[PDB]
Amino acid sequence: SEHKEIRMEAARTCSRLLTPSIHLISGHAHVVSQTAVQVVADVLSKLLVVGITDPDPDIRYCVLASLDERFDAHLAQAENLQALFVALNDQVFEIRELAICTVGRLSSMNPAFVMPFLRKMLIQILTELEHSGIGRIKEQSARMLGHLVSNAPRLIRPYMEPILKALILKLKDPDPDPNPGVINNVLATIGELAQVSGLEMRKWVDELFIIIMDMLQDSSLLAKRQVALWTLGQLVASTGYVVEPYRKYPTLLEVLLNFLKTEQNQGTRREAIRVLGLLGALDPYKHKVNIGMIDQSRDASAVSLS
Amino acid sequence: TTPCARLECWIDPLSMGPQKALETIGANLQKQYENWQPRARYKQSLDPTVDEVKKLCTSLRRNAKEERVLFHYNGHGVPRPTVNGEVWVFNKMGSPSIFVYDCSNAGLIVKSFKQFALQREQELEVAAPDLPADLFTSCLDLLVASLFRNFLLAERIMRSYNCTPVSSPRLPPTYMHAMWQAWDLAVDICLSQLPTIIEEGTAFRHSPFFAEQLTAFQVWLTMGVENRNPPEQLPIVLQLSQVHRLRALDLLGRFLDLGPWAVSLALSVGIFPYVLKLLQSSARELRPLLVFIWAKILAVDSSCQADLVKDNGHKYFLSVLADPYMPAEHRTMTAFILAVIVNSYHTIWQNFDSARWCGVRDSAHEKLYSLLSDPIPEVRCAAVFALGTFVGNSAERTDHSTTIDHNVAMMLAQLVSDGSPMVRKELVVALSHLVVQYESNFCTVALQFIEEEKNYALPSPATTEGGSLTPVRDSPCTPRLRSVSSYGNIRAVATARSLNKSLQNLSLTEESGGAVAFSPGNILSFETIDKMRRASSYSSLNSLIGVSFNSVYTQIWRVPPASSTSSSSLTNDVAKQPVSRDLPSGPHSHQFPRTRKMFDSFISATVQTFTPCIAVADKDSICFWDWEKGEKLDYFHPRYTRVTAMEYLNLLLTATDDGAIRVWKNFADLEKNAWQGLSDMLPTTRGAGMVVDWEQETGLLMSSGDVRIVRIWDTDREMKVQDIPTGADSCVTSLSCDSHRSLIVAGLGDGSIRVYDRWVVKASLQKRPDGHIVSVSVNGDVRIFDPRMPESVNVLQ
Amino acid sequence: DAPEAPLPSRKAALETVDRLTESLDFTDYASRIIHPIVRTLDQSPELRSTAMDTLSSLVFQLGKKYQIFIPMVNKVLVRHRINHQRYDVLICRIVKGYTL
């Protein structure tokens, strides 16, 4: 196991210019726990790498991340990476984002360096990481974040008015992605009123993007608990309607759950009456295994058939 | 003063007239100013003259007191009213501060100053003179009143507006107004600092202190709402600038929403995150989450200290920064708020840890005279030692110690009380940390002939001061000549008798520092008493030593274990078996347990290795008679070569008295047992090498000599002189390596020891006055070393 | 990237500067400001002196982003051959503004 890389030291350290990707696609399996791998985790990130050859010599030290001894080198790795996000490299934007996810994350500089990528937004999904990417870190110190956060919705909420869409969906994905941040979302929950309206008034476009409106309504409802008892029956109504236009309903699956995880339960089948039939309807029709699946949970988690 | 200083006021209704409640608003200012204070002259509507009068009244009002002075204005239909003169003829510790409220003229007014100053600066010179400094003019729809006027009052009041205004209040909702008083006690305390962050953020270095000035300067920054109008009203100041920005600014934003909940009803809260959430990761960077930052924080910590807070965790986090010092310690004093607040609490116990930890390290910053803080520590710092705990107070007690030894503000009587408690625990700690500390607590006495009460421990510590450790440390030698400062007055008289007693008690620490230190004025372990034995070798496990004796009876001593004589006159050799206690001698052999001879120019040096007895035989063919066989496999070929010593892992060494030191390639003698043959024959040292060091785990050479110098040698590819020791005035018997470390450990016919560093520099030197060191011993990892001298051997650690 | 009309490419990049001078500029937008830095390398050297000024106008207000963003732009104008001036002057200035 050991000698596999032991000579490859000189090799991986030395050139072979186009290949050392595969040098460093290795190790990466495995170990060789001696302190050279420290410096090996270093100098090949000190060259560093150039011209789209970059992504893994990023991923690597992310996979090569370790601790605790020399704390410089640890976030010194990060230091580098942090800088490296910007430089074109459109997945290598993502990819180093996609990494880390644990650990160390902190240095007050960093959030100020973390944030701007949330402030990219381009490309959209790049941001969508750091939200969750801070989703934890949010709750280390909201000090920087919670407000840096609070900006974002305060930045984001206004985006509900401005025409359509391509952003109004680029509202959607960033809506929950902070929800790994809990408390802030709690202490506001006017995202209800905004979005509660967002679905109602129609018909604006194809609006195909709507479906992801709902996902957030859902994941929110988790942190939303009996607080969320507000506005419901409408939702139960509206969605209960929304169940029967404009299909695929992957959400109403996940959607209706969490409502009942916020617990209007058995009387619901009065308010909305036919939901039984309405489900009893769907069940044979759709395949969409989840839809096959979730109606159960829908049913199941709802009720108790009376 | 209380309230601070003199202030000016004006209002523009129009021109020369009163008004309903226009009277009333003026006081509200003075009130608000008293809420910020001071001697305030209200006016209304005046034609310029009536104004001009009271300026001179305040120009009379004696501000050499005031810490500042103010000139307010407000909006009249553009009253031009002495663009220059009254202003400029009243012009540049009661420091003047000017205030402007304009559509335009504000800057112009400011612009005017400099311009008029440009005159009233330059044109004064040829008159050989108004000096602009400490004279500043601060600059200024549906819901306003007068913004920049309200701004400073009203600091938060205005803030609540830019809250309600607008888009954010969707989230926090909702508005109403007012009420909410004692929960608001924090918002100020917050918004107090919330700006100051940006301040320490942007300050550089123009800054506070002086209060009401900064109080404005703070409230100035509330102008960043400025948002109203595409002329976002852009106050101008030249005593900056960001506004905007300043994350705390973006931060206070939801620090409001923390309050917008509880205000809805019922209060209830209470609490709120801000100070807390700011407090927490202040440790983060404080630990290692910052690269220099610049502390990013400390400003916050200051006001944070003032409350019961959280006060500890702050004061805790304080010492954290005090740990990250020295580098940021200045920045602490930049903020200095310790000097403010740390001194501001002389009121600690649990805190005494931090009060030490913060304050000690603070007090450590070296320094500022405590002044009355010295009586406070004479209370507080003294009462800390009451528990005799902890070592957390070990040197922490000694914080205040050198202060009395620093300068005299007594430091004598208030110290006398401590003078009792100080020396008391001094011997009770018996730890050089608080002791070498308490050495300063001792030093705290200054001159101050005190009492036998003082003279009581004078001997008592001096005893432990004899004890110390490595008492021959030249550190004592200087520390000896230290108190000899008091002794320049000798030989007389009274305690001078008592002085000489404590004086003579310390023996002498002599070189190497003393070798330098002497002219400026101009552990020693075991010592056996018997006739001088030539070479001495301990049994490994047992402290029983062989000592080959000049009295021919080679003695065993477990530090008498036994003598032995199979030999005559000088017995110059003992080498114990590397495993057994079996020792050779010269060339009789013994085993200290059997304590008798095994088997017998004479061979004065032999050492067990392989299993060589490594010895250079004077038959001139060096004979190592291998103790198993007692047979010499190498006898090879014009003197008695000075050395046969196995180079540890690999080899041997031979110096020759002709001057040629010959490194051994002994391989074919070791491979048989090139029997004896020279690797490097290098006459440099004119004669017999007094010591050769074949490095323990490496191959360096050495040549010691009685040449009154030494040469370190590097023998790898070939022997070459590494560096040279020197400074010997007498015959240097030998040296050695430190086992793992590099210490040339040398000794001389003076009885003194030279510990020399790999510069070939003797760093430490043990000296004995009466001896001549021809012999030494060493214990490598754990260390107890047996030296020798003319009376008899002296072991030392 | 505009359609290929070169006028906006400058003129847009100007109205920026206009506000890049004025209030509320950087942090909320950073990459989106640095992204077009590349668009200067690609399209007409027209865009240089505008890029000179766009980027410059930034350098004034916020220096955080400035330093970052040191190296990126260092390589930027290499391909675009500029390596000058006032922007660099600012760079010198504000690096010195860090020494100051």
Author numbering:
A (entry chain A): 613 to 918
B (entry chain b): 78 to 169, 186 to 221, 256 to 267, 340 to 438, 441 to 548, 584 to 758, 778 to 814, 878 to 904, ...
C (entry chain a): 1123 to 1222
Give passages from the manuscript:
mTORC1 is one of the most important regulators to control cell growth and proliferation. Deregulation of mTORC1 has been found in many human diseases, especially in cancers and mTORC1 inhibitors have been clinically used for the treatment of organ transplantation and solid tumors. mTORC1 regulates cell growth primarily by phosphorylating a large number of proteins, including the eukaryotic initiation factor 4E (eIF4E) binding protein 1 (4EBP1) and p70-S6 Kinase 1 (S6K1). In response to multiple growth factors, energy status, and stress pathways, Tuberous Sclerosis Complex 1/2 (TSC1/2) complex serves as a negative regulator of mTORC1 and functions as a GTPase-activating protein (GAP) to inactivate the small GTPase Ras homolog Rheb, which binds to and activates mTORC1. Here we report the cryo-EM structure of mTORC1 at 4.4 Å resolution.
Using a Titan Krios electron microscope equipped with a direct electron detector, we collected about 500,000 particle images of the mTORC1 and reconstructed the complex at an average resolution of 4.4 Å and the central portion was further refined to 4.0 Å resolution using a local mask. The mTORC1 architecture reveals a hollow rhomboid shape in the front view with overall dimensions of ~280 × 210 × 130 (Å3). The complex adopts a 2-fold symmetry with the central core primarily formed by two mTOR molecules. mLST8 is located on the distal convex along the short axis and protrudes out of the rhomboid architecture. Each Raptor binds to two mTOR molecules and extends towards the distal convex along the long axis of the rhomboid with the WD40 repeats domain located on the apical side. The C-terminal region of mTOR protein forms a compact core domain (designated Core), in which a “C”-shaped α-solenoid (FAT) wraps around the kinase domain from which the FRB domain protrudes out. The N-terminus of mTOR protein adopts a spiral (~1.3-turn) right-hand super-helix comprising of 16 HEAT repeat (designated N-HEAT). The middle region adopts extended HEAT repeat (designated M-HEAT) bridging the N-HEAT and the Core domain of mTOR. The dimerization of mTOR protein in the complex is mediated by the inter-molecular interaction between the N-HEAT region from one mTOR and the M-HEAT region from the other one. The formation of this interaction does not seem to need other proteins but is stabilized by Raptor, which binds to the ridge region of the M-HEAT repeats 20–22 in one mTOR and the convex side of the N-HEAT repeats 11–13 in the other mTOR. Structural comparison of mTORC1 with FRB-FKBP12 shows that upon binding to FRB, FKBP12 would be in close proximity to kinase domain of mTOR and therefore lead to steric hindrance for substrate entry into the catalytic cavity of mTORC1.
